[PDB]
C-alpha cells in the first residue's frame, strides 16, 4: 500500500532524510517518534508529496508517484493529511470547510455533500458548530473539524503530522480519541506524535527516528519496554 523506498531529502546544506524506507500495509496504525531534527515530519510528508525526495522513490498502491508521470491530485485523493496547525479555511464555515473539496474535486451533488458533512460533524461531535467559522472554534474543535474535512474525501490512508502538539493539554484527549476511533475502524494511519499513549493504545507499529534515519522499530511494547538500541533508550529515558 505505501512504500517509501530509500529516500533522501535535502533543504540546501541541511540533510533531513538520509536514506529512509517505510512500508505500511492496509489497516496498520504506524507511529513515528523521535527528537526534533529526526526527520519524522519530512518522511511523513514524502508520502503525499508535500515534499520532493532528493533521491529514492515512493510508491502508493504499487505505482511510483515521484516520476512526474502521474497525476498528483489523483494521488492525494487517496491519501489524507491532518496538520499540526490545523490549516482550516478561515473564510469558510465548518460545513463549507468539509464540502469544498468533494463538490469541487469529486464533483459531488451539493445536497449529498451536505448530508456527508453533517454525518461527519456528528461523528467528531461538532454538529452544533456546523455553520460557525473557525475563529469561533477551540483548538480541539478545530482539529476535530480538520479531521472531518479530511475524511469527507474518503481516503484509504490518513497522514497525521503532530496533530496534538499545538493543543492545550486539556484538549489533547478529544482529538486523540477521535484518532483512536478511526484506528479501531481499521483506517490505515501514519502518525507522527509526542503522545506515546496513542501508540500504546492503538498503534500497530512504532518507528524511532534519529538524525534523519530509522534507527529502530517494532511493536509498541517491544520499543517501550525492550528497546534494543542505545539511542532509542536515550530518547525514551528523556521522554517516558
Amino acid at each position: 500500500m505505501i512504500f517509501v523506498n530509500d529516500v533522501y531529502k535535502n533543504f540546501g546544506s541541511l540533510e533531513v532524510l538520509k536514506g529512509v524506507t517505510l512500508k505500511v500495509n492496509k489497516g496498520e496504525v504506524v507511529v513515528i517518534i523521535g527528537p526534533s531534527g529526526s526527520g519524522k515530519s519530512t518522511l511523513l510528508r514524502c508520502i503525499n508529496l508535500l515534499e520532493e525526495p532528493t533521491k529514492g522513490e515512493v510508491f502508493i498502491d504499487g505505482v511510483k508517484i515521484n516520476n512526474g508521470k502521474v497525476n498528483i491530485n489523483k494521488v492525494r485523493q487517496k491519501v489524507g493529511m491532518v496538520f499540526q496547525h490545523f490549516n482550516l479555511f478561515p473564510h469558510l464555515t465548518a460545513i463549507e470547510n468539509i464540502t469544498l473539496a468533494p463538490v469541487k474535486v469529486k464533483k459531488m451533488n451539493k445536497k449529498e455533500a451536505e448530508e456527508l458533512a453533517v454525518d461527519l460533524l456528528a461523528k467528531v461531535g461538532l454538529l452544533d458548530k456546523k455553520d460557525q467559522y473557525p475563529i469561533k472554534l477551540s483548538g480541539g474543535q478545530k482539529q476535530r473539524l480538520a479531521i472531518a474535512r479530511a475524511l469527507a474525501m474518503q481516503p484509504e490512508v490518513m497522514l497525521f503530522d503532530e496533530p496534538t502538539s499545538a493543543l492545550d493539554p486539556e484538549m489533547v484527549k478529544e482529538v486523540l480519541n477521535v484518532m483512536k476511533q478511526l484506528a479501531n475502524e481499521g483506517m490505515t494511519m501514519v502518525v507522527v506524535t509526542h503522545e506515546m499513549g496513542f501508540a500504546r493504545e492503538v498503534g500497530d507499529r512504532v518507528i524511532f527516528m534519529d538524525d534523519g534515519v530509522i534507527v529502530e522499530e517494532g511493536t509498541p511494547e517491544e520499543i517501550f519496554y525492550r528497546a534494543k538500541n542505545e539511542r532509542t533508550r536515550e530518547f525514551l529515558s528523556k521522554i517516558l
Binding site: 491530485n73 493529511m81 496538520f83 496547525h85 490549516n87 479555511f89 469544498l100 474535486v105 480538520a146 479530511a150
Partner: protein, 215 residues
C-alpha cells in the same frame, strides 16, 4: 511684504478648482494603473520565461527610477516624434505606470502573505492549483490587497503634485497663478499644503476604518 492670509480668501475658487483637479488626476491615474498592475502581476506568474523576465524588468525599472524622469520622458521626450500629448494625458500616463508597478508588487506580496499552510491543506484535499487559487487563497489575498491598494492611492495624491512642473493646473499649480497677481508665494503654499494634509488625513481615516471592516 509680510504674511497676509486674509488676502488669499478671494482665491478660494482657485484652490477648490485646483483641489478638484488633483482628485480627477489621481483617481483616473490609479484606476488605469491598478488594472495595468493586475495585468503585470499575471505576467509574472506565467510559466513562460520570456514574459516573466519582461514583467520583472518592467517592475524593476519603474520602481528603481524617479517619477519625474518618467513624466518628462513621456511629455518632453515624445515631442521630437511629432507628439504633443497634453499635460493631462502625460500625467495620468506617468502615474498609471508608476502605480502599475507598485500595484503589481502589492498583489504578489498580498498573495505570498497568505499562510502556505492554506495551499497545503487545499492541495492535500485533492484540489489543483487552479481550484486552490479560486476557492481558497485569492479570497484571502484580496483582504491583504485592498488595504494596500487603498494606501497606494493616498501616495498617488501626494505624488501627483509633480504635474505642476509640466504646467498642469493642479492644486499646486495654483500657487504660481495666485502669486502672478499677488506676488505672494508663502501664504498660498501654506494654504495648499494644508489642503493636501487635510485630504491625506481624511483618506487615511476612511482607509483604516474600511480595513477594520475587513481585518
Amino acid at each position: 511684504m509680510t504674511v497676509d492670509f486674509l488676502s488669499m480668501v478671494k482665491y478660494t475658487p482657485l484652490f477648490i478648482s485646483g483641489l478638484i483637479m488633483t482628485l480627477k488626476l489621481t483617481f483616473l491615474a490609479v484606476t488605469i494603473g491598478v488594472l495595468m498592475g493586475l495585468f503585470i502581476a499575471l505576467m509574472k506568474m506565467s510559466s513562460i520565461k520570456p514574459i516573466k523576465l519582461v514583467a520583472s524588468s518592467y517592475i524593476e525599472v519603474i520602481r528603481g527610477t524617479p517619477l519625474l524622469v518618467q513624466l518628462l520622458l513621456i511629455y518632453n521626450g515624445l515631442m521630437q516624434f511629432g507628439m504633443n500629448i497634453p499635460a493631462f494625458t502625460a500625467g495620468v500616463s506617468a502615474l498609471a505606470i508608476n502605480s502599475s508597478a507598485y500595484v503589481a508588487e502589492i498583489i504578489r506580496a498580498g498573495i505570498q502573505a497568505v499562510d502556505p499552510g492554506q495551499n497545503e491543506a487545499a492541495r492535500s484535499l485533492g484540489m489543483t492549483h487552479a481550484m486552490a487559487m479560486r476557492y481558497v487563497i485569492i479570497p484571502q489575498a484580496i483582504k491583504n490587497i485592498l488595504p494596500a491598494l487603498g494606501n497606494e492611492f493616498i501616495v498617488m495624491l501626494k505624488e501627483s503634485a509633480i504635474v505642476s512642473v509640466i504646467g498642469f493646473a493642479d492644486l499646486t499649480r495654483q500657487a504660481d497663478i495666485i502669486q502672478s497677481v499677488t506676488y505672494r508665494y508663502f501664504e498660498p503654499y501654506i494654504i495648499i499644503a494644508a489642503i493636501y494634509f487635510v485630504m491625506t488625513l481624511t483618506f487615511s481615516k476612511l482607509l483604516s476604518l474600511f480595513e477594520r471592516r475587513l481585518r
